Amino acid sequence: SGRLVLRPWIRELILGSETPSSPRAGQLLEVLQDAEAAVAGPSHAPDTSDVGATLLVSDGTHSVRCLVTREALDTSDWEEEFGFRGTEGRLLLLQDCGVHVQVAEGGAPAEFYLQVDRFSLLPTEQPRLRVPGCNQDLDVQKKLYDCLEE
């Protein structure tokens, strides 16, 4: 019956000259930092509900680190348990995001990353394919260094 494919978008978005207008579908490769739900009231248990989620997201061609803002998380309505672990391989729609620059810090070189302010989780689950990071791309690398020089 054929298959419905998603267009790669990461490399083109970064190299493009404008902030994203339309939503972008991607696969969740890995949870680098999961999030905890905000629990009301004082408790000796640690509260980390002011930190977002950090995800590694693939578009079939490249991966990118995504910071899922606390704003995106708290407004969202969750079917299963709050947070992302257990959803590796699922399709993920980034409805509101932006390309940001992270300067070198704590041993890690500068890179482009995404900040996600609104997302939805699609039901589609799929095999996870090893894929180069978008920052390993020569054109991206060149633009990173242009960006840093400002």
Resolution of this model in Å is: 3.0
- Beta pairing partners, 149: none
Give the domains, in start order, of the chain with CATH numbers. 1-150 (2.40.50.960)
Query: What amino acid is encoded at 126 in this protein?
Result: Q
> 37, 137, 126, 119: which is closest to 89 by C-alpha?
126
* Inter-residue contact 134 to 62 (CB < 8 Å): yes
For the chain, the farthest-separated pair of C-alpha atoms sits apart, in whole angstroms, at 56
String of b and e for 59-71 (b: at least 16 CB within 10 Å)?
A: bbbbbbbbbbbbe
Alpha helices by DSSP H, listed for 27-129, are: 70-75
**How far is residue 149's CA from residue 103's CA, in Å, rounded to a whole number?**
11
